[PDB]
């Protein structure tokens, strides 16, 4: 309702939502940047995090206790797991888990924190709002697992691995299921709407380079018309 | 001088230097428990984080911004790579970063997070302080390189792999590195006092159930000393 968070990594991936603020206006703390404004007739806090699990949770944590948001929506570019999907594609997350957690020496699950949830749950009336939105852009999308870790998925032998491990697993990248352990902690209600920049393979750091600007245009274009329906 | 956080991971390794305090008092947030009190003639505030990086980020990011700390303190036990350590002994800090920490594929070294520093650096007036206080107390100990990640090291294989690409780390465990990197981003002084539970290998879960309480009372008994002459 009231008050809606949005959180994204790197600087090309927030700069589309802020320039279509009206009445714009920036605020500082340690290295965080927020951008307070007004969109499709919504008051909107725009947090650019950087990259990585500590930088997402860090950030997280600021937002919730400064801005007292109704709900978070986390947007930015992903690697491919699932063969049926193109460069450009929407992902929208249902559950989210870690791929580099190992606590199996004492019995817990491959993926699993000590004392935590084996994974965290999305929002159900945000998936089934979104999901209507993507019909009516006309924009292939896909709902399902997304997994992330603290490296960047760049050959055969590292997807493979992940494959076998997680074979229901998706897409693959660094900050949702950190952001998501956080709002789990303090009660808030989160989705993810990322778009496709690469396949997670030898080619990798090559599409990345070429399609960063792409996947942020369909992932932005995306959540502007959900905020209009909220 | 006149404010002194601590942090701790499990309640086993809080529980000896919370029943030090007089007049004690105890407030809650989120899962974070924090209890208030004097310790040798000085004001401090003990937190429980819960296990891993998010945990710890969180954690620190609240001390930090709701009682305003001149200095932190890290507390607790961890596993030896170093051929010469014993069970028992205590571990001084002077750089700390991560082994689980992969963007090689656009140029970064191995560890390193994306537009940070490769390691991040313990303040040197505590270190020297630290060090003269575990002569008095006759305690074995030792200052070098600590190393982080989300996974328990209970295997030949997986040690092998660490000393390999970090040849001149002294030991490994679950939150030093992310405290770390919050303070870096909030400007505060850092410092880790842990002690020995386990060597690492193919005996570490056995080792770590006889031996958790010993590295507590170890390293517990260094930082009471410690806050006497702060």
């Known amino acids: 309702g009231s ?3 949005i959180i994204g990594a790197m600087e090309e991936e927030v700069t589309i939502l802020k320039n279509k603020l009206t009445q714009l206006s920036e605020i500082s703390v340690a290295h965080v940047k927020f951008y307070t404004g007004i969109l499709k007739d919504r008051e909107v806090v725009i947090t650019q995090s950087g990259i990585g ?7 997280t944590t600021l937002l919730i206790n400064k801005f007292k948001p109704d709900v ?4 930015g570019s992903a690697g491919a797991l699932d063969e049926s999907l193109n460069v450009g594609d929407v992902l929208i997350s249902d559950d989210v888990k870690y791929h580099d957690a190992d606590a199996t020496a004492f019995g817990y699950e491959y993926g699993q924190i000590p004392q935590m949830p084996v994974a965290f ?6 998936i089934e709002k979104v999901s209507q ?4 852009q006309q924009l292939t999308a896909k709902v399902g697992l997304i997994v992330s870790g603290d490296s960047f998925i760049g050959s055969v032998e590292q997807r493979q691995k992940i494959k076998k491990a997680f074979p229901n697993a998706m897409a693959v990248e660094m900050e949702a299921t950190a952001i998501a352990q956080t709002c789990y902690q303090f ?9 496709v920049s690469d396949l997670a393979n030898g080619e990798a750091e090559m599409s990345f380079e070429a399609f960063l600007e792409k996947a942020a245009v369909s992932s932005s274009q995306t959540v502007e018309a ?5």
Do not use: E, Y
Request: without cysteine; proline residues 5%; positive net charge.
């Open 3 to 5: 008050m809606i968070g």
């Open 53 to 59: 699990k500590v930088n997402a949770a860090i950030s």
């Open 72 to 75: 978070i929506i986390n947007t």
């Open 121 to 126: 749950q999305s929002s159900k009336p945000l």
């Open 133 to 136: 939105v993507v019909q009516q």
């Open 187 to 195: 009660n808030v209600p989160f989705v993810v709407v990322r778009a």
């Open 226 to 230: 959900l905020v209009s329906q909220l």
